[PDB]
Amino acid sequence: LGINCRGSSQCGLSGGNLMVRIRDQACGNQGQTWCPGERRAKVCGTGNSISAYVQSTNNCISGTEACRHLTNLVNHGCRVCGSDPLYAGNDVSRGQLTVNYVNSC
Amino acid sequence: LGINCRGSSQCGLSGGNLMVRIRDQACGNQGQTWCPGERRAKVCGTGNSISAYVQSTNNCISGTEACRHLTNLVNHGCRVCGSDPLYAGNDVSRGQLTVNYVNSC
Structure with missing residues (x-):
């Protein structure tokens, strides 16, 4: 399982392309380091959010890399939620950036 | 380019899990064969629709195969639109089932 648009049923929102907004946040600040579990980019609703974060690994990635993975998600067609494996050719269980x-917000 | 959720911006405006409904139509009528361009499963709005059809190949596929590909799209996380290559380890360029x-309806 590589890049995909799987996510919670709540991700089912018609209209706004939230993935684009999340991508823009990440790409606008490529200086930060993304470590496991840190929701460094997100769009908040009331008491919730669509958040981006690294998981399935103990490793951290550069803000440049996070920007690239989020751009991959937008280009794949994921409008709200999805995940991109951190390592080329590898399954997402070996490390992934998930939205x-x-x-919570 | 393999399985993906790419589609017209209109896809994102549509509400509901249209991909599941389209899959249900195809899987409920596996007897029909799908030839290029035939919109065999679809959910219409007023003057338009989200339709499924084979493209990028001269071949036709069985309804059982169309059901399988649409299930692949549902499992991939594509809520409304997306495409699945028809042939193993191939690029959608060699044939794909597109939603x-x-x-038009």
Whole structure:
């Protein structure tokens, strides 16, 4: 399982392309380091959000890399949620940047 | 380019899990064969639709195969539009089942 648009049923939103907004946040600040679990880019609703974060690994990635993975998600057609494997050719369980619904902002 | 959720911007405006409904139509009628360009499963709006059809090849596929490809799209996380290559380890360039917005029902 490589790049995909899987996510929580809450990701089912018609209209706004939230992935684009999340990508723009990441690409606008490429200086930060993205470590596991850190929701460094997100779009908040009331008491919730669609957040981007690294998971399935103990490794960290550069802000430049995060920008690239989010651009990959937009180009793949994921409008709200999805995940991109961190390592080329590898399954997402070996490390992935995921954008998904979170029960807080 | 393999399985993906790319589609017209209109896809994102549509509400509901249209991909599931389209899959349901195809899987409920596996007897029909799908030839290039035939919009065999679709959910119409007023003057338009989200339709599924084979493209990028001269071949026709069985309804059982169309059901399989549409299930692949549902499992990939594509809520409304996307495409699945028909042939193993191939680029959608050699044949794909596409679900996309069409300006007619």
